[PDB]
Design an enzyme around this catalytic site. Sequence first.
Site, PDB file in Angstrom:
ATOM      1  N   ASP A 138      -5.174 -11.014   8.360  1.00 53.47           N
ATOM      2  CA  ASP A 138      -4.421  -9.766   8.461  1.00 53.47           C
ATOM      3  C   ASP A 138      -3.791  -9.385   7.125  1.00 53.47           C
ATOM      4  OD1 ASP A 138      -2.924  -7.607   9.204  1.00 53.47           O
ATOM      5  OD2 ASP A 138      -1.436  -8.733  10.386  1.00 53.47           O
ATOM      6  N   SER A 166      -5.602   7.289  -1.329  1.00 58.62           N
ATOM      7  CA  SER A 166      -6.925   7.875  -1.263  1.00 58.62           C
ATOM      8  C   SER A 166      -6.881   9.273  -1.866  1.00 58.62           C
ATOM      9  CB  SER A 166      -7.394   7.916   0.203  1.00 58.62           C
ATOM     10  OG  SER A 166      -8.591   8.661   0.366  1.00 58.62           O
TER      11      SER A 166
END
Length: 330
Positions: free
Chosen positions: A35, A199
């Site tokens: 994770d 992004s």
Amino acid sequence: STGSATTTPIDSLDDAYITPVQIGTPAQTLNLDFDTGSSDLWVFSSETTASEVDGQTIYTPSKSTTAKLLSGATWSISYGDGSSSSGDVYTDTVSVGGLTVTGQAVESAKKVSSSFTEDSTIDGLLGLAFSTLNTVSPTQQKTFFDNAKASLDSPVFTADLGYHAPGTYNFGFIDTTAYTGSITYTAVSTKQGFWEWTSTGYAVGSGTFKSTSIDGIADTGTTLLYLPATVVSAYWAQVSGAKSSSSVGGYVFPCSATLPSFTFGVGSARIVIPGDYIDFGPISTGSSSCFGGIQSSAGIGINIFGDVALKAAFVVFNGATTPTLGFASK
């Protein structure tokens, strides 16, 4: 040194991925959920409340000759999906795909919430976010990666998750055969303890690319792709019959649909998520309403590039002095 381990979807939907991890001496192999959105290595154990164990493999520290109780240390964690666990702490030897760390903090669960109990395939979590998020008290502990880093050939690990198929976590090297083209690297902020990046935008299907900054985290422990409501609405508008359902808890769509792809930007590069990756199947057994793999982050507080996005790429978690993230197509 290096390590290399196969990671395997837990079910037919790729709801999560498990990777075998050797703990203790002799080795006790547990299948952990790696994770990158958390920083505790915790396991079901011989100390876990018996009624809260249902099929998981447990770590028994008393059977490990290298286990040592970390005196006075406790841990307690709550995850974004509302699940939680807590317990005490041992140090022990932990190996992943041939890479060994001695003295790793292994957090032994005394309590786990229902969703963990109900998932027989996950024996615990191995956190790969920054150690500043580790919950051990009163002395915060380091992640497996943080402990291994100085010994690695290169201070990196890579995530290569499969779609409906096994993939790979590598530590200490970049497998140049595992991706196509080049790896595009992008800046990371560690200010919130996550692999947080921005992004450069998105496209829906064959549509034009929208240049827009989307801050979010690369999180292998989250199944879906959570993005701003504007982006998600634009995606689902291209699917006839798709709607946001408050009763179900997100966007659903007719199971008869063919989904469009979703592209996200990494600098000037582009990662394409095929439409099929966005299908998470019937909302309930036998239903013709299917659950979407792109969902709104509104009210989460953060955008999350979970498995839906990451499995479309070869992803480099670069733990150099100034960390960065790399993405390649594959």
